[PDB]
Design a binder for these strands. Structure first.
Length: 243
DNA sequence: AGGTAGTCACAGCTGATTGCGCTGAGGATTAGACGTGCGATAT
DNA sequence: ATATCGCACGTCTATTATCCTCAGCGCAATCAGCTGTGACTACCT
């Protein structure tokens, strides 16, 4: 098995880490997100890719981590690289990320699910061994553009408004997380930092080549349980095999 | 007096049933005028 | 030598767009029914 998908629900404090709109500013959830990335950065080496819902949520996420004495712990393990809207600044950040994963220093690539870097690059083996989805990526309902499409599909194709948003959210989430497996010898780790993924309505939106590897045993396991699964998976995936 | 048929300590399965998670809308939560004050200046 | 203008130093008031608690429909917790294993207890002809 070249992939080990798993969905992480409540954290070590038995509190859900869902990226709900009403809980974006909650201090309990943001601590677990940093806590999840802390032990995760020390189990999967040479490349971790993390996608956030939006830049606005991304900048507020690191600010809370920086304010607490938690982000510095991640720094000494892996280098933190932040993807910005500027193409030139993104390119140099990706350039240093590639060489950081090339040697043993390691690095973390922080970006947005709905960004040009999510699909503009491919994470081949030894690059981005772990892909982390911090919550279900939902497109912003503002600008009165998506709702216009939702209304049109409502009375024309009988498309459920919730289903289309779920379909769009899971499509982008599954597309970016599926870029860590390029080649038969390639392997990677796939995680989901949201209890909303654990629901059947969103699991069924994952591609069939990931459904069979997503065992029902690990759908609501905590951060500590997820680390143990990651350690066991990576330990046995480094052994030599046959073509 | 002999044989067996319920019967209760668990366990499994099945078919349903109903019960809560999925967000989102209508109602309660410190810089200009106005003075002074002070210091450099007309009669 | 004493009132008078420039400069400064504040202070009161405001010509004007924020955060809480009630709604169907689908996936999951719940339950009645039935049966399987083992020994037990007893009862009629």
């Amino acid at each position: 098995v070249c992939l080990c998908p798993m969905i992480i629900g409540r954290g070590n404090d038995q509190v859900a880490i869902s990226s709900k709109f009403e809980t974006r500013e909650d201090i309990a959830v943001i601590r677990n997100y940093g806590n999840l990335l802390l032990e995760m950065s020390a189990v999967v080496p040479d490349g971790i890719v993390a996608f956030f819902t939006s830049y606005q949520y991304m900048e507020s996420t690191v600010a809370s981590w920086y304010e607490q004495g938690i982000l510095e712990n991640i720094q000494r393990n892996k280098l933190l690289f932040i993807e910005t809207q500027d193409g030139a600044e993104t390119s140099v950040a990706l350039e240093k990320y590639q060489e950081a994963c090339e040697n043993g220093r390691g690095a973390i690539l922080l970006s947005v699910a709905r960004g040009k870097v999510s699909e503009g690059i491919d994470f081949v083996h030894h690059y981005g061994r772990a892909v982390i989805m911090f919550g279900v990526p939902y497109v912003y309902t503002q600008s009165r553009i998506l709702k216009a499409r939702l209304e049109y599909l409502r009375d024309q194709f009988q498309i459920r408004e919730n289903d289309f948003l779920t379909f769009d959210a899971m499509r982008h989430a599954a597309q970016c997380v599926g870029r860590a497996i390029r080649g038969k010898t390639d392997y990677g780790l796939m995680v989901f930092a949201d209890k909303r993924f654990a629901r059947g309505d969103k699991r069924g939106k994952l591609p069939r080549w990931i459904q069979e590897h997503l065992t029902d045993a690990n759908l609501n396991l905590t951060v500590d349980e997820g680390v143990q699964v990651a350690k066991y998976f990576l330990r046995q995936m480094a052994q030599p095999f046959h073509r």
